[PDB]
Amino acid sequence: GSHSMRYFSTSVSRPGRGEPRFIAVGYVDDTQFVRFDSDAASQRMEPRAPWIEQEGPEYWDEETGKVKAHSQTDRENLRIALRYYNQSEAGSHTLQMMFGCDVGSDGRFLRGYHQYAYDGKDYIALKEDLRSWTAADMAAQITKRKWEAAHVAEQQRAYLEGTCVDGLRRYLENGKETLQRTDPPKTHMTHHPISDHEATLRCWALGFYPAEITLTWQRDGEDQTQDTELVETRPAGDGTFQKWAAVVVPSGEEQRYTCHVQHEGLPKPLTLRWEP
Amino acid sequence: TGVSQDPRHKITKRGQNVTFRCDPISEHNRLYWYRQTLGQGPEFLTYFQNEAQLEKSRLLSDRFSAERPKGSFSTLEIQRTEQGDSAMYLCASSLHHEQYFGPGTRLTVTEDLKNVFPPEVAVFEPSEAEISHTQKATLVCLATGFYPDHVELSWWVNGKEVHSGVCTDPQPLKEQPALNDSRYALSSRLRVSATFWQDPRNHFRCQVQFYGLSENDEWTQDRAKPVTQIVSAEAWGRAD
Amino acid sequence: GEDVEQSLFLSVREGDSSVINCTYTDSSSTYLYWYKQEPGAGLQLLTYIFSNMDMKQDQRLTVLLNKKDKHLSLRIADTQTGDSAIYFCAEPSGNTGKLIFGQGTTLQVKPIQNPDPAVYQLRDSKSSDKSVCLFTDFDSQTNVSQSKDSDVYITDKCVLDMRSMDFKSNSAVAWSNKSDFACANAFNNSIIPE
């Protein structure tokens, strides 16, 4: 369908116990393809899927030099933020950025992303029109005035519309077997009666990709309630994901309700009921 | 605004040391040094991201060092300056991607300061044949016998710098062109109405600004110290 | 490995379109500059295009880019004798913002003014003794090379604009301390094609 590529930087100051720590990770869709960790021996953009290992010597040396200079830049970025917030150096802080781009089935460019968070909060993000920034506070405003004078957005747009897309298409084509697959969800139902008066109905989606799912309980027609609970989608660790949804009910009342699964894979959205 | 650079000209003895300053535009986190030898495009030397020197080149020798203490102005020390390092040392600064350049430091490295001569200037007055044939008068300025090639030649008419009807030579003439150490010559021309030229209340001054030696430069020869100085020639308008 | 290639030298007539191409080194370069150097010391940013743009117009300047060929070209629609200068194309290199430059194209712009060739002798304002030969109002296709003798100095063709009269003239100068030096016989064998 439409696919995406996101890199995620994370820098964390370590007053007294060295220079800050930089960790970056690459993803296409819900599938991680590289990693760099500044504390590691290797000092290199390392591969993280068996399909990205086929890219030639140049790719590795190129990517290492960049993610290495990404780290020296987000290093000094922590230093500036300190000063913008007049915070004491003895304190430890966290700068995360996230960027990347998206394409349709036409393989054509769709959306860019370029966002920063300081200490777990939005700082500055490039609008979907890629000419402007949203500043979260009056320090971001300082950044927003420099970046508008610099013409950062015009330059970053060129990267996103260009090298970012080019990258993504190659990965979708070298990695087609992995990245361009739908794994349908395997769906079973457990029942654990809490007492003789009431029982628990758990709706299981296992071993499906990508992560996006919508699991919906209902009784005798439509039912959306906080009587229902959902655990956040979790990774199985083999490249598929898991989710379960539970609902509680009276006894001998198990067929009044059904569970409904939507996923990219399934030609038809399913229904699940309890057989003793 | 614009990047600044001290000093704009430098003459060293071969093997003395030399430090250039560069002040970039306020609030510009990135600073780059290049060198450029005339006839060529600039080669990258070193890069600063505030206080941190994040890139240098193979080019850059042990002898070369740069520093941006305080994240602002930068220096460039060159040690044991050989003639080879005679070059324009340019400074650029950028908020992000757009570099703005300085006016640069033109460095001439000479084996000995007895090779420094200031120019001799002369104005030559126009031909009867021009005046009649064209109703125009051309003066020629001739500056000769100067090393190094650190001059700025201007025309002044009744005390006004003339920014039209002038071409100074695009670049100078070596008296012995084959040798690298050789003195230089340079012409400028000013063309006017032959009626401007005939008015005798009209002053014409040719002016060569030479960039020579310093107070801190040491001179013990039987000759006037070739300091930074203006040397000029004058002609008055003639009814003839 | 490889370098930003452009031409060393380009000649053109007042009012013609000057067109400096270069070929740059890496597709991933998001921006490309033209800088300008006049006689002197000051290197001045002219214009730049982003890699996601075909064209960029700016008064008399136009810039075209073909990312696929890594081909960049600067265009100047009416050309003046003032436009004469060195024009450098410049590409980012690596992960700094650091630039590699072309060798720079010199734009010689030729006056279209009707030639009226002449040599003259000028006398020193202070010493009648000292003289210079001037060669002026000569054609632009005419070129002054330097001397055959080594005691005789000839300068280079140099364009002069008197802006009150809309007038331009190539001109060169020659001199000598030789006893026999003759203005007629100075430039006459130094007249060469463009």
Binding site: K66, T73, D74, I80, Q155 | H96 | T30, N95
Partner: peptide, 9 residues
């Protein structure tokens, strides 16, 4: 594929 230039805050 990564960028070759990153903004300063």
């Amino acid at each position: 594929q990564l960028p070759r230039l990153f903004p300063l805050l």
